[PDB]
Amino acid sequence: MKIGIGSDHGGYNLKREIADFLKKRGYEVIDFGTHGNESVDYPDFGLKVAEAVKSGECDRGIVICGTGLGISIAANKVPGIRAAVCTNSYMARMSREHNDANILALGERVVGLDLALDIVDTWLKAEFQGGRHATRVGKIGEIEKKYS
Amino acid sequence: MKIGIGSDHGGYNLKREIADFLKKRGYEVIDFGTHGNESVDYPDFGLKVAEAVKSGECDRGIVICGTGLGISIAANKVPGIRAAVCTNSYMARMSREHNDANILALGERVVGLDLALDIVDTWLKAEFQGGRHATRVGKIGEIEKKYS
Numbered sequence: 001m002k003i004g005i006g007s008d009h010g011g012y013n014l015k016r017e018i019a020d021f022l023k024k025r026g027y028e029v030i031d032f033g034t035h036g037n038e039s040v041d042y043p044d045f046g047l048k049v050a051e052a053v054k055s056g057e058c059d060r061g062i063v064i065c066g067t068g069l070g071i072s073i074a075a076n077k078v079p080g081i082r083a084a085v086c087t088n089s090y091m092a093r094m095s096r097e098h099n100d101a102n103i104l105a106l107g108e109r110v111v112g113l114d115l116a117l118d119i120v121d122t123w124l125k126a127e128f129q130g131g132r133h134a135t136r137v138g139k140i141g142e143i144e145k146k147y148s
Numbered sequence: 149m150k151i152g153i154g155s156d157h158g159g160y161n162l163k164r165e166i167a168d169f170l171k172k173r174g175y176e177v178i179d180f181g182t183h184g185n186e187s188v189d190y191p192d193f194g195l196k197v198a199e200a201v202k203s204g205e206c207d208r209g210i211v212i213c214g215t216g217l218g219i220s221i222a223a224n225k226v227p228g229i230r231a232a233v234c235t236n237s238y239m240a241r242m243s244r245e246h247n248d249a250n251i252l253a254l255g256e257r258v259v260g261l262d263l264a265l266d267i268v269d270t271w272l273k274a275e276f277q278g279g280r281h282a283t284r285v286g287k288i289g290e291i292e293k294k295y296s
C-alpha cells in the first residue's frame with residue numbers, strides 16, 4: 001500500500017526518518033515535502049497529503065509538524081479525510097479501529113523518534129472495526145455534507 | 149468568557165469534572181451533553197459545541213471522548229473551527245499560541261484527571277501570537293473555502 005508523507009520545517013527531520021523506516025518495510029512512499037529546514041506553512045503540505053489520500057493516489061498519509069496540530073486541522077478540512085494526532089500507540093490503534101483514520105499526525109517536538117516509530121508501526125497494522133464506528137464515521141460525513 | 153463543553157459517554161465523567169473546575173474559576177459553562185453513560189455518537193456533541201463556538205454563543209469549547217480523536221475530527225469539519233487534541237500542557241499552549249485553537253479536545257481514557265486539568269488551565273490562559281501564525285490560519289481558511 002502507498003503511504004503519502006508530508007511536513008512543514010517543524011516536522012522535516014522526523015519525516016526523513018519515517019520515510020526511511022517505511023521503505024525498509026516495503027511500503028511505497030510518496031514524499032510531498034517540505035524538502036528542507038526553510039520556514040514553510042503547514043497547511044500547504046497537509047493539503048497535498050490529504051488530497052493524495054482523497055484521490056486514491058495514496059492509500060493513507062502521515063503528516064508531521066512541531067506538534068501535529070496545525071497540519072492535521074488543515075488535513076481534516078478536506079471531506080473524507082480523518083487525520084488523527086497521536087502521541088502514543090494506544091491513540092494510534094484506536095484511531096484505526098474506531099475512527100478509521102486515513103491520516104496519522106505527529107509532532108516532531110513532542111514525541112521522540114522511537115516513540116514516533118512505535119506509533120507509526122501500530123497505526124499501519126491496526127484495522128477498522130465497523131459496526132457502530134461506521135455509523136459514527138457516517139455522522140462525520142453528515143457534517144461535511146452540511147458545510148459542503 | 150463562556151466555555152461550551154460536550155462529550156460522548158466515553159468523555160462524560162471527565163466532562164463533569166472539567167465543568168466543576170471551570171465554574172469554581174468563575175467561567176460561564178454551557179454543557180451540551182451527553183448527560184449520562186448511555187452509548188451516544190461523538191459527532192453530535194462535537195457539532196453542538198463547534199456550532200456554538202462558531203455562532204459566538206460560546207467563546208471557546210472543550211470536547212471530550214475516549215481519545216479526543218473522533219469528536220475533534222468532527223468539530224474540525226465546521227469552518228472557522230480549530231479543534232486541538234492535546235495530551236500535555238505544551239501542546240495545549242502551542243495550540244493557542246500558534247493555531248489559535250478555539251476547541252480543546254481531550255481523551256478521558258488517555259489523560260488522567262489532574263493531567264487533564266493541567267492541560268485545560270494551560271489552554272485557557274495561553275494567547276494567540278499572530279504574525280506568521282495568522283498567515284497559516286488563513287491558509288486553513290483557504291482549504292475550508294475550497295470545499296465549501
Ligand SMILES: O=C[C@H](O)[C@H](O)[C@H](O)CO
Nearest residue numbers: 010042065066067069070
Ligand atoms: O502546528 C504547526 C507546527 O508547530 C510548526 O512546525 C511550528 O509553528 C514551527 O514554527
Ligand SMILES: O=C[C@H](O)[C@H](O)[C@H](O)CO
Nearest residue numbers: 158190213214215217218
Ligand atoms: O473517538 C471516540 C471515542 O474513542 C469513544 O468514546 C469510544 O468509541 C467509546 O466507545
